[PDB]
Design a protein around this ligand. Structure first.
Ligand code: AR6
Ligand code: 8L9
Ligand code: HDR
Ligand code: ZN
Lengths: 297, 8
């Protein structure tokens, strides 16, 4: 599909280029108030993110009106406003960080390979990156991951041409195994651990909220349904329709940054600014739950 | 081990 990238040209791209819907301003405000109630009211909240949450940073999505697959399907080159290294976390990224700090977010499941959740400061132990991360390479022998500052340079679980530097438990001489990228190609198996954690988080969630995914790729796209299957609610935030629209308790057609901005105001939380790449391996001890938010005027 | 696809 990406020719020098060496990825499979046999992929089903799914449904590309559906038109975007925008809920009218009055209906948006009402729906976002309803989301805020649901966040507050709910104990276990899981977010599911896709490419739609990095469009504001200048990274294209896959199946939107100017998505990478959409353009390929109609014979055009994709367009990218920024590089992966120089992309900046959005308000949505930064909002999710704050929601995690205050205990309003149990787990975050993402299909994005852009590295922006990690670089935003979001704790890695509350994050499943189900399709990989451009910045993360992994040792074939011992499974040790390396988070880098620049993209590792291959895709499709290929060798990056660097070796493992871990000194072993008994002997403490270098492992030397082959480091590979973590970017899944079409029909590669997902990461065992990350999927299991995402699945368990999703099963036991009482609210799943999807942001900026069309939910066409499995198993990622079906994880938000497991929530509904055990009595939970499902909120879908997306400009295009999604594959699972019919199962949503609440559906919001608007820009995701707007929704998250309004969501945080209703909860009385500030969205932090971003200092720069800050890899956080373990979640900091929880901030106290904020004071009860005020009801709709 | 579950695979990344559209599944249909
Ligand atoms: N600012 C925004 N606000 C809300 N929605 C938006 C915004 N920008 C775009 N969207 C919506 O965001 C949605 C993006 O959906 P898709 O482009 O299918 O990508 P995926 O992340 O679900 O995952 C597809 C996987 O498949 C690939 O092969 C890779 O492997 C991916 O990991 C669209 O419906 C847009 O309308
Ligand atoms: C800084 C850098 C060092 C490298 F070694 C390599 Br390779 C690339 C970069 N640039 S990067 O921003 O991180 C970078 C990383 C990955 C890709 N992906 S890609 O497979 O080329 C590709 C991109 C798009 Cl939008 C459409 C298609 Cl069809 C294929 C692009 C860039 C970039 O050039 O924008
Ligand atoms: C810079 C902008 C680049 C955005 C898109 C880069 C392509 C990511 C490659 C993912 C491969 C998908 C295979 C699974 S199906
Ligand atoms: Zn190793």
């Amino acid at each position: 599909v990406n020719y020098a990238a060496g990825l499979s040209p046999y992929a089903d791209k799914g449904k590309c280029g559906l038109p975007e819907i925008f809920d009218p301003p009055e209906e948006l405000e009402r729906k976002v108030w309803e989301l805020a109630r649901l966040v507050w009211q709910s104990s276990s909240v899981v977010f599911h993110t896709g490419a739609g949450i990095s469009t504001a940073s200048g990274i294209p999505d896959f199946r939107g009106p100017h998505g990478v697959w959409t353009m390929e399907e109609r014979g055009l080159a994709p367009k990218f406003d920024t590089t992966f290294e120089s992309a900046r976390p959005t308000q949505t990224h930064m909002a999710l960080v704050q929601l995690e700090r205050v205990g309003l977010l149990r787990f975050l499941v993402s299909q994005n390979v852009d590295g922006l959740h990690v670089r935003s400061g979001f704790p890695r132990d509350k994050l499943a990156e189900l399709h990989g991360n451009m910045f993360v390479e992994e040792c074939a022998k011992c499974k040790t991951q390396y988070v880098r500052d620049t993209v590792v340079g291959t895709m499709g679980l290929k060798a990056t041409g660097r070796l493992c530097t871990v000194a072993k438990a008994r002997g403490l001489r270098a492992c030397r195994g082959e480091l590979r990228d973590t970017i899944l190609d079409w029909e590669d198996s997902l990461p065992d651990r990350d999927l299991a954690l995402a699945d368990e988080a999703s099963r036991n969630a009482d609210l799943s909220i999807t942001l900026g995914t069309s939910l066409q790729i499995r198993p990622s796209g079906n994880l938000p349904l497991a929530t509904k299957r055990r009595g939970g609610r499902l909120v879908i935030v997306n400009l295009q329709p999604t594959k699972h629209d019919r199962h949503a308790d609440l559906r919001i057609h608007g820009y995701v940054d707007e929704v998250m901005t309004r969501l945080m105001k209703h909860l009385g939380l500030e969205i932090p600014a971003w200092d720069g790449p800050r890899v956080l391996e373990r979640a900091l001890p929880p901030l106290p739950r904020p004071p009860t938010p005020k009801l709709e005027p | 081990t579950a695979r990344k696809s559209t599944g249909g």
